[PDB]
Structures are given as C-alpha cells and as structure tokens.
Amino acid sequence: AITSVDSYLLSEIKPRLNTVLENCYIIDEVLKDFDYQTRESFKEAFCGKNAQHEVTVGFNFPKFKNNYEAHYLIQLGQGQETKNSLGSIQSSYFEATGDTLVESSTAIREDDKLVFTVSKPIGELIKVEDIEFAKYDNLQVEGNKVSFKYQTNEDYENYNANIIFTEKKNDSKGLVKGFTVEEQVTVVGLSFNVDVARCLDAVLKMILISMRDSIEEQQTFQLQNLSFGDIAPIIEDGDSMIFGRPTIIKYTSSLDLDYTITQDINKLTFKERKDWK
C-alpha cells in the first residue's frame, strides 16, 4: 500500500503511552535506574489514575499552544527508495487481500460442526491460535466463518481462540507493483523541566521496544532503527527554556499498488488447417 509512518506512530504511541501512564509499577520498573527523587517526582506528577498533570502527543506546526510541561512532538522526516524488484513485481495474487487482522472468537456447535465466526470475510487464514488440525478434522473456511468437525472434538464445544487472518476485497487477479522505501520520523519529548525530558526519553524508548512486536510493524514498517540526539534547549527566550532530546525512528517499508489484470483465459482450442501450396 501507500503508507504514512507519521500517522502510524501517532496512532500507536498515544494508546500505549496512556496505558503505561495509568499503570504505576510499569513506570516504577522503567525508571529504576534514575535518581530516587526524579523517579518519585515523575511518578507522583504524571503517573497513575489520579495524575493531575498529563502528557500529550501530536504533530508539529499546530496553530495553538501546547502542553509544554510534557509533550511528544512527532515530525515526519526524510526517506529514499532502497531496493527494487525485477519488473517492480513486489508480489502477485489470485484474490485481492486486505489488511492482516487478529480477532478473539469462541467456538459454537452448528449441525455437528464446530464453527468460529469472524467479523469480516476471510481472504486467508494464517493461524487459529493453539490448534493444528488433522485432515480428519475436515477444516474448511467459507465466507466469514471457519468450520471444524464436531465428532471427535465435543470437549471443545465452547473453546475460546484468537484467529489471525486477512480480509479479502474482491475476487480478482493482479500484480502488486511497487518498491521498498527507508524513511525517518523524528520524535522529541518537550519539557521545561530537564528531568521530565529525560524521563520522557526513557518512556519513549520503552514504548518503541514494546512496539517492535506489534503486527503493524512486523508485517510492514520493518527494521526499526533508533538514533538519539543531544539534550538541548528547543526554545531559549521565554521566561524559561524548553528542553528536549530528539530521537529518530527509521523504518523500511513497501510502497505499492494493486495493478488488477482483467484478462483471463479459460479455454485453449486447437484447429488443423491444410496447406495445399
């Protein structure tokens, strides 16, 4: 697909940041190496459900004033194409497949089959969690349902699973045409307190490490590489300075389009014609 690393990072960082900040022992583990007073002051101010201060995330160049006490500024950077395929063919498909998804589901009995229901039509099934079927189990997929023989499996009549699958758009042939790009985004934790900037740096590094395992950047946005700048005053001529430490996140990812092929051939036919010269 076409991709937007900045909007991915914003969407991914915001919930993760919230869920760490609402959970005191995570911060208590992340900041174990800092000075005791720095740790306790940060945990008192920003952390837990009762926290009176708050962190914020957003893109650069807003028209309004931000929470300069603690704010992650996201800042889309450079990139370049790095590797190309022969014919620019990144892949080919017989059935137009959408995004990868993971969904929780439960088995139910139906007509002496077990079935799992999924919210969308299954374009491909990658994994039913914790199950490997035998041929006897007569595994079949149909529409948005996975179906599974009941006879030997009655103990599992309400078994709970996670389905990893991917959507289908439509039944069509085509070529995925495109290339790989290596692209940079900068993130900086702004604070007018230097110890807050240093803690926001630690929290962001933890978040990015945790992010490396996510399906989003396992399937796309691969090879996350991190670089770190000096701590410096970002703005120097207010009533106080604003400090930050930049980090650069670099990703390798595919830019591509679905070139559908309308041509289809369903019968050869043969004829002999005679040359009398």
């Binding site: 650069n60 160049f61 807003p62 028209k63 309004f64 004033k65 931000n66 300069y68 704010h71 500024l73 800042q75 702004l190 970002i234 703005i235 001529d237 207010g238 604003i242």
Partner: protein
C-alpha cells in the same frame, strides 16, 4: 511605571508562544532582584 508593553507573538513548530517585553521604572529605595515577579490586577489580556 511601565512602558513599551509588547506582546511579542512567536509562531513555532511547537506552537505559539509569547516572549513580549516591557520597561519598568520602580519606586524609590527598592532593590529588585532577578526573576522577581509582578502582576497587574487591573489589566486583563485576551487569550484563546
């Protein structure tokens, strides 16, 4: 007594900020010190 009361708007990638500056003349026999703070309760400034 206060003069040259400038707002000093700045527009930045981080957002807007005010860096405005003014010149003040004190009363007699006072030793004002660095980062001492003044407020002017009569004067109200608009913000968004």
């Amino acid at each position: 007594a206060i003069q040259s009361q400038e707002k000093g708007t700045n527009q930045l990638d981080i957002g807007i900020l005010d860096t405005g500056t003014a010149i003040g003349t004190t009363q007699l026999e006072k030793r004002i010190s660095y980062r001492d703070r003044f407020t002017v309760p009569e004067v109200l400034m608009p913000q968004q």
